[PDB]
């Protein structure tokens, strides 16, 4: 958020999280390339976007 | 991996289990290689999207490779290359083959 | 990349590929006889924009 | 040359489907009254002629 | 009989020239399914004898 | 308008627009032949024709 | 006036047809002819709008 | 089609149909070379209402 | 000469069906040089007066995907259809009129 | 078209194909009267000239 709505967390134990919601940039690079493979590449593609 | 399992000396990938044969190499065996993994990955975690299709586009899986790239009037290129990074289900596959 | 007036510089295909071309043989031919083009434009009215 | 024809047709294992082609081709072209006549004979090309 | 034997051998036989593929989807499809976390349970002391 | 726009060829068609209109009191050169001061300025769309 | 029904000499076929959409289909990429060419005639139109 | 309302219809798949024809079916089809050389260079836009 | 016969394109037996003999044929050659230089034509600056950047790079995209798709006829010719026409010779009524 | 759609079977072993293909073609004996025929060309041409 560009620094806007700055937050923070508290501060105290937290035993037995997990939270897999990451990827590396060569994943995201793959996914998009792998998107681009699977649309028309006339105007149909671009629209929506 | 597993298309080029099935061919011979393919890529850069482990062989194991090249003992077995594997007479039929065509182009469209590979197609139906392809489509049963995306099958399998779709069903087991659930997927709804497009996932791994279009690859399939010009029917030849067995040279299968992703890139881009743009040009100048110029007559330079850029040839960006889009390899895929570390993986642990492949590795993991190969010691099941092994084993 | 966006280029201004630069006549050598100007991108007119961006491109991508399926396959490996080095495989077909095809890593001397030309790079638009190897991947694939997009292709979308979009006829905007100067008159809004002014 | 008839009987010829029909007697390699008859015996080869080659199959002539033109599926892929079409679906590749029609991820590029889209048969609309505006960009028609670049395209008018791509589309005779991939008439069914039977 | 994943692959290369639908339409082409009979429910009884199977595809010796076709061996490796098979094999291999079928140990995937092995892999895929024990995708999942040994997760803990109810642990109890034994007051019996054994 | 111009510099709102993402087309390269966008300047050269914003300066052949007002060549159209002055091909009479002041001409210029045109460098591929077939091409003239009075074409349509929106045809000047490759970099060879600047 | 309304007893009539019109006679097509050549079908679409219903292999033609994608899954249903709930009630609609989409017509199959690989399918060309006149029909083709009005399929897209009104898709075009319909993305305009 | 009880008024003009279904005028716009009726005038839009006309006309997609007698350009397909035109550009189309039409030279695949007839023999005659001197008809297929006037048949081309001829569009609904300016030889069609 | 006797027991021999002309035939357009060159011939070689008939190996494995893997991929380099797929893409190696001299009619795939062809394919690729001739939709290689039609490429380069439509996109010289003559054909300014009807095909802006929008058409070229349709045009280009249409000529690409034709050169891309694979396609085992080159393969056919090459290796296959030269059996085919041997022995049909050996049987037909009336044998082969050739210069 | 012919050129560019070279679809092949799945499991094609070409020795199977070609002599199961192969087998009924020299269940004909044209071949034999093909060369009687000629025979008799040549002694009447040889009688007529």
Known sequence: ANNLLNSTIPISLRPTILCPWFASSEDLRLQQVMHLVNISSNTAAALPL | SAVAQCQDAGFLVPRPLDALRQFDVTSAAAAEIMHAVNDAFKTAFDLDGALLDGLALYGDPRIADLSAAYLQYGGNVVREHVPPGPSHIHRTLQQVEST | PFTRLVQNDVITNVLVARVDPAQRGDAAVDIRATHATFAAALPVDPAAIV | VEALSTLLRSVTPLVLDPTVLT?????????????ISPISEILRLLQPMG | KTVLSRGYIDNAQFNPLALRSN???????????????????????????? | AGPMTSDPHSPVKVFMALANLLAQPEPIAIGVPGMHQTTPASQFSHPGVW | EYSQVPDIKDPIPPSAWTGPIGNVRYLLPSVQGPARHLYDTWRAAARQI | SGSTATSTEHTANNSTMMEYFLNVHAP???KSASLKRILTDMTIQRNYV | PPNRMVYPWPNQPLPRLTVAPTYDSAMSNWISTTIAFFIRVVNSVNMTATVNDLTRRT??????????????????????????????ASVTVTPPFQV | VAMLCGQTET?????????????????????????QRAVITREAFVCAR
């Open chain 4, 23 to 35: 679906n590749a081709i029609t991820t590029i072209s889209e048969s609309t009254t505006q960009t």
């Open chain 5, 23 to 50: 094999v291999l989807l079928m140990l995937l499809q092995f892999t895929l399914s024990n995708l999942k976390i040994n997760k803990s349970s109810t642990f109890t002391s034994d007051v019996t004898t054994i």
């Open chain 8, 28 to 30: 695949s089809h007839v």
């Open chain 9, 59 to 88: 045009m280009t995209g249409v000529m690409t995907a034709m050169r891309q798709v694979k396609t085992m006829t080159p393969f056919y010719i090459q290796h296959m259809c030269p059996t085919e026409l041997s022995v049909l």
């Open chain 10, 11 to 35: 499991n094609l072993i070409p020795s199977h194909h070609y002599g199961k293909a192969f087998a009924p073609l020299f269940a004909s004996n044209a071949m034999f009267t093909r060369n």
